Amino acid sequence: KSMPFIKHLASSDRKVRTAALNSLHAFLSASALTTLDVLKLWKGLFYALWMCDRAIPQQNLCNELADLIWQLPRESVATWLRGFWATMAREWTGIDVLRMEKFLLLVRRVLGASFKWMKKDTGAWDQSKVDEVLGLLAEWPFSLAEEVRITGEIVQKIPVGMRLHVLDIWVDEVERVGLLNEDEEEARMIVQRISDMVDALEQTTKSPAVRTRSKDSLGDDRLPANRR
């Protein structure tokens, strides 16, 4: 697969990065993506945000990157999001204090788009898309294991800061897509399945920070299991 635009996403010239993104949009429009294809695409997208210095272009770029999910064939979305989490997991400890905030926002929007992707728009949610999104939460931020195999050939260790960020925002992002509606049976099951993943994380984790954030987010007053 020839993806010549990828190396230009890291250009110091933002006009070149913008053109490289448009080639990527057209490339995704036009065989199927492999695990290796999305790792290369997401590293290029990672560095495209890394080079973005301005607050408003960063906010647009995070939404642009998260909304790429709607351009993808149904069969490639889960492979695509695994490439995202593997990318963030590999690159996490190298992100300096000055550049962290825009990558925290990227994770939030990509997670938020993943939740919105689960939705149908009286069955309101696509359970096959729910299994894929939640299975990735179990695979990366809420994994009871400490490394992920990608074949194995490629083994990636899960950084603790990535878990801590997802633990900070998962209630925010289930609320934003409307999953905290106490009156939906379908929605409460999805929140329960996510809560069970976080509960399992708090029981097993070696990290007191992860243990504390998991416990904290499970006590969130917004969760229906904590109300009335």
Side-chain angles (χ1 to χ4, degrees):
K1 273 214 178 80
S2 203
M3 322 193 268
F5 49 84
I6 286 195
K7 73 187 91 74
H8 299 130
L9 293 156
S11 166
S12 66
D13 186 354
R14 99 195 220 170
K15 291 185 215 193
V16 180
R17 300 199 297 269
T18 296
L21 271 162
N22 299 320
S23 304
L24 183 133
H25 284 280
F27 170 85
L28 286 183
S29 315
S31 182
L33 294 171
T34 57
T35 301
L36 197 61
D37 284 335
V38 302
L39 289 172
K40 296 184 187 174
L41 291 166
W42 263 119
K43 175 162 212 244
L45 291 171
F46 179 92
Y47 284 135
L49 180 55
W50 178 278
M51 301 306 267
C52 195
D53 284 344
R54 300 118 153 108
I56 271 55
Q58 283 163 5
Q59 293 153 21
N60 280 349
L61 189 57
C62 289
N63 295 339
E64 190 180 345
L65 265 40
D67 289 349
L68 288 176
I69 195 175
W70 312 101
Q71 295 196 213
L72 295 170
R74 172 76 177 77
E75 60 169 334
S76 290
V77 172
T79 320
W80 171 260
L81 297 169
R82 165 160 301 121
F84 168 78
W85 290 108
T87 286
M88 292 311 297
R90 179 191 74 244
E91 303 281 358
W92 194 275
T93 53
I95 301 173
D96 45 276
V97 163
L98 294 201
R99 284 187 180 92
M100 184 69 68
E101 198 67 39
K102 62 184 177 180
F103 287 109
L104 300 183
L105 181 71
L106 170 70
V107 172
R108 187 194 285 274
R109 296 291 189 248
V110 168
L111 180 61
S114 296
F115 285 157
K116 186 152 172 233
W117 180 71
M118 306 182 315
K119 185 135 66 151
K120 284 177 189 157
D121 217 290
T122 166
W125 302 86
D126 188 326
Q127 294 294 329
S128 265
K129 295 178 175 182
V130 168
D131 294 339
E132 275 158 39
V133 170
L134 270 59
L136 282 155
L137 291 174
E139 192 178 59
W140 293 94
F142 301 156
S143 176
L144 307 179
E146 283 290 329
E147 51 191 43
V148 183
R149 271 142 213 252
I150 315 170
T151 174
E153 300 287 310
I154 303 192
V155 177
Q156 181 64 55
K157 153 84 193 322
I158 301 156
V160 64
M162 196 189 80
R163 313 180 177 274
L164 296 175
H165 180 53
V166 175
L167 285 169
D168 290 341
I169 72 182
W170 76 267
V171 180
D172 279 349
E173 300 319 304
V174 299
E175 192 189 15
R176 197 193 308 278
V177 292
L179 274 157
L180 290 193
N181 195 230
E182 317 139 321
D183 288 0
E184 283 200 68
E185 245 298 300
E186 211 172 13
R188 294 201 32 140
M189 258 310 297
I190 294 169
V191 175
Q192 183 83 50
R193 281 172 69 188
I194 302 174
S195 297
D196 292 348
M197 281 187 280
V198 173
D199 174 83
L201 187 65
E202 184 215 318
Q203 274 179 255
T204 69
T205 185
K206 265 186 319 176
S207 173
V210 170
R211 194 149 68 233
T212 304
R213 301 254 192 118
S214 303
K215 195 192 204 308
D216 210 53
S217 77
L218 287 170
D220 205 303
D221 303 326
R222 295 176 286 174
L223 289 182
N226 287 330
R227 294 153 72 71
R228 166 158 28 80

